[PDB]
Amino acid sequence: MFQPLLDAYVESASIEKMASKSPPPLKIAVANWWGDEEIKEFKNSVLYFILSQRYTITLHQNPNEFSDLVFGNPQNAKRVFYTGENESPNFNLFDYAIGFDELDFNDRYLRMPLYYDRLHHKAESVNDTTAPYKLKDNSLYALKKPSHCFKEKHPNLCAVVNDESDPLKRGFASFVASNPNAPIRNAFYDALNSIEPVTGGGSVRNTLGYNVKNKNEFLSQYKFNLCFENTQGYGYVTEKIIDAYFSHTIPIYWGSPSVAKDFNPKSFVNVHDFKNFDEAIDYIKYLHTHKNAYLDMLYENPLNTLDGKAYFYQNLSFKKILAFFKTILENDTIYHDN
Amino acid sequence: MFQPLLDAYVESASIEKMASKSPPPLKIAVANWWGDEEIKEFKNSVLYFILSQRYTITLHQNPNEFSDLVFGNPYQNAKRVFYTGENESPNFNLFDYAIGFDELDFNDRYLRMPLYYDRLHHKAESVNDTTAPYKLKDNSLYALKKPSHCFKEKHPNLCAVVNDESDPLKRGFASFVASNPNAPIRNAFYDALNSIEPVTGGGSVRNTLGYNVKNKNEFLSQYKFNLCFENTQGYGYVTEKIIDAYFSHTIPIYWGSPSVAKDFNPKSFVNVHDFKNFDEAIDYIKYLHTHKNAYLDMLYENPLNTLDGKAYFYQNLSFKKILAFFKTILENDTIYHDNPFIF
Numbered sequence A: 001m002f003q004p005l006l007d008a009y010v011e012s013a014s015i016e017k018m019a020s021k022s023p024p025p026l027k028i029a030v031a032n033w034w035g036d037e038e039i040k041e042f043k044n045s046v047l048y049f050i051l052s053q054r055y056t057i058t059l060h061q062n063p064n065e066f067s068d069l070v071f072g073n074p075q076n077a078k079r080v081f082y083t084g085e086n087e088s089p090n091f092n093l094f095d096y097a098i099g100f101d102e103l104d105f106n107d108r109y110l111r112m113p114l115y116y117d118r119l120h121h122k123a124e125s126v127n128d129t130t131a132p133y134k135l136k137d138n139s140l141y142a143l144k145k146p147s148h149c150f151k152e153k154h155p156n157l158c159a160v161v162n163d164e165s166d167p168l169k170r171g172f173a174s175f176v177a178s179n180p181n182a183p184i185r186n187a188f189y190d191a192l193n194s195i196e197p198v199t200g201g202g203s204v205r206n207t208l209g210y211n212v213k214n215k216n217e218f219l220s221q222y223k224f225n226l227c228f229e230n231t232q233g234y235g236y237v238t239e240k241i242i243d244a245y246f247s248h249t250i251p252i253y254w255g256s257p258s259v260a261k262d263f264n265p266k267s268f269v270n271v272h273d274f275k276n277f278d279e280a281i282d283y284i285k286y287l288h289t290h291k292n293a294y295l296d297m298l299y300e301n302p303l304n305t306l307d308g309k310a311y312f313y314q315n316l317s318f319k320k321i322l323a324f325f326k327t328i329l330e331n332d333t334i335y336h337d338n
Numbered sequence B: 001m002f003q004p005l006l007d008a009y010v011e012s013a014s015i016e017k018m019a020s021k022s023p024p025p026l027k028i029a030v031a032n033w034w035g036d037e038e039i040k041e042f043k044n045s046v047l048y049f050i051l052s053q054r055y056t057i058t059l060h061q062n063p064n065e066f067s068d069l070v071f072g073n074p075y076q077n078a079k080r081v082f083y084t085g086e087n088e089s090p091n092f093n094l095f096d097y098a099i100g101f102d103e104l105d106f107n108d109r110y111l112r113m114p115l116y117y118d119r120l121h122h123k124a125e126s127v128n129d130t131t132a133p134y135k136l137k138d139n140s141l142y143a144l145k146k147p148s149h150c151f152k153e154k155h156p157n158l159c160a161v162v163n164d165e166s167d168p169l170k171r172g173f174a175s176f177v178a179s180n181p182n183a184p185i186r187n188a189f190y191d192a193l194n195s196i197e198p199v200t201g202g203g204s205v206r207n208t209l210g211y212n213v214k215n216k217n218e219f220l221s222q223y224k225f226n227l228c229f230e231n232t233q234g235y236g237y238v239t240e241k242i243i244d245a246y247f248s249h250t251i252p253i254y255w256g257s258p259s260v261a262k263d264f265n266p267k268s269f270v271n272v273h274d275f276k277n278f279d280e281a282i283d284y285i286k287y288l289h290t291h292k293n294a295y296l297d298m299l300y301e302n303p304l305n306t307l308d309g310k311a312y313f314y315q316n317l318s319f320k321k322i323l324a325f326f327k328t329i330l331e332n333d334t335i336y337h338d339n340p341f342i343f
């Protein structure tokens, strides 16, 4: 049930209006070894989008210009490490880091998992007159002119979300990956497949004859999505589980053993909850033949709730991200090795 | 006043005594290049000491041997622990666990055990001596071994000033013992202070005596202040240096960790971090050096901070805390380090 997840995301993107004040110039250098795809990706990331609400940003890649921040990936400016990969920061080289780890280093570290960036992209993709998902009026993401192509590209997704189709009347499970260097993910596929065909849409264990072009439309056509990170790490929760919620399919998840902190455990299969794969495949089999249990799970809020409100673990929000950077900009200390 | 610090350190070292003289085996892999000197030094560090109270330790320096823990900062797929003397944060991609100086919380994966704690362990050990001016509680862990009798012979002047048999005001101005040349801020500060009052240099850097002092503690006890600078700045990076000052009964003139006041009573030493520039702190050093009362106030302050009258180590660093950390490590089977696989 993606809608409540989008509602909380849209709320977490809420920030004070700045009428009286004007977005001050902020100059951000990107490290030299950063490719051009890396730069395109950063410029389109939720981080860049967030900062762009409070600063007039200039992004460059010139080591000779005095900048306010420098973003890298392993000068005398403040260096910020920002990874979308399962890599802990090196605090000897970087003053500040943005990652996945469940760690507290006061002002030096901020946990901002890639799932949050994926939510940003989804939110923008439903600012569309044809989308089955709704954004609160006058919220930041509804500010821009909407598109009108959503229903066209996702007929089956819209159909199911629009109650114009039965979720129980679809295939078993999808699996979309193109990185073959993930032994646990590959072994889990083989194991579940041999118990019920699992449909492959990416380079790996493919069974379509081509690689799907629209993952969300593709995932909308099955009851479950094999949702495995490519390696285990505590707090390492990427775009994958989001894609499953968004496509209205049950995530069968593996990756961060602490994933229940970030998402409501009644909303998905957490393979980490079992002692072995057989036991998890058992629960999946059960879900697939007991329509009410399958249904309950599909309609659960993806987010946990406390004090009568759905929430993002540790209150991840635009304000949290903006305060983290506001603290970096005002603090003169250089922590990296000189 | 070192006595109270030693008193707190001895209390922090109290744990129940091994119930049964059958400490379970613990195999630790350490640096392959280490010679017998380094192995002796490690068998004498506080971390080894604390663990030997609960395990029968065996060290391994053979790469083709299995171990329960793999140490230091040099195996790839073993239970790895990062431990370094340097001002270096841990690489958590390679190490499952780490022990360091950083003020960081990574739940079960990280423990802050500053080098100052190990220096205290060594001071306590040396004062298990019939001639020492510092006393260890009876039947306490450090008192249980056979004591030596050479302390006074080697630290006469130190004993004299601690044993109220000499005047602390009747000593030179300041000592400076450093041999690592690469330490810009420290080197620069010694010049600054030295031009407003000769600073006696006992190490290879800014040497004044014409020779390198063999007993640092005996030497520093002969001056009112000790120039106590770390070689680099780091939050929580407090080494053996400030401890040697307290031990030698001289006022530490300190720079290094800007949060050093969390670990130590700021009324007991000159925290250069607390000043806008060197000149302001030097002014304060001059003031204390010419206002007896102020000088003795500081020299007599408890080195440790107190809470409701009781002295404490920041975050309750203790033998119990260190053993609980290692018990969790040993009992946790989760591999946290990157799980290599070549493709």
Ligand SMILES: C[C@@H]1O[C@H](OP(=O)(O)OP(=O)(O)OC[C@H]2O[C@@H](n3cnc4c(=O)[nH]c(N)nc43)[C@H](O)[C@@H]2O)[C@@H](O)[C@H](O)[C@@H]1O
Residues within 6 Å of the ligand: A084, A085, A086, A114, A176, A177, A178, A179, A180, A182, A201, A202, A203, A211, A212, A213, A214, A215, A229, A230, A238, A239, A240, A243
């Ligand atoms: C984004 C990046 O993913 C990393 O996981 P990795 O195992 O290296 O790549 P993966 O194979 O899981 O694919 C990454 C995402 O792209 C989707 N995908 C894969 N193949 C296809 C395809 O043929 N057609 C479409 N439309 N989509 C595809 C896949 O489902 C994933 O969502 C991870 O290490 C890193 O942290 C990042 O998440």
Ligand SMILES: C[C@@H]1O[C@H](OP(=O)(O)OP(=O)(O)OC[C@H]2O[C@@H](n3cnc4c(=O)[nH]c(N)nc43)[C@H](O)[C@@H]2O)[C@@H](O)[C@H](O)[C@@H]1O
Residues within 6 Å of the ligand: B085, B086, B087, B115, B177, B178, B179, B180, B181, B183, B202, B203, B204, B212, B213, B214, B215, B216, B217, B230, B231, B232, B239, B240, B241, B244
């Ligand atoms: C132990 C190590 O010290 C590191 O500090 P560093 O600047 O690298 O070396 P330093 O020059 O400060 O010496 C370290 C300690 O040894 C003492 N010392 C130096 N020279 C002499 C000497 O000639 N005679 C004696 N008796 N003692 C000497 C000095 O006073 C220091 O206490 C630090 O980076 C690292 O983390 C460790 O603390």
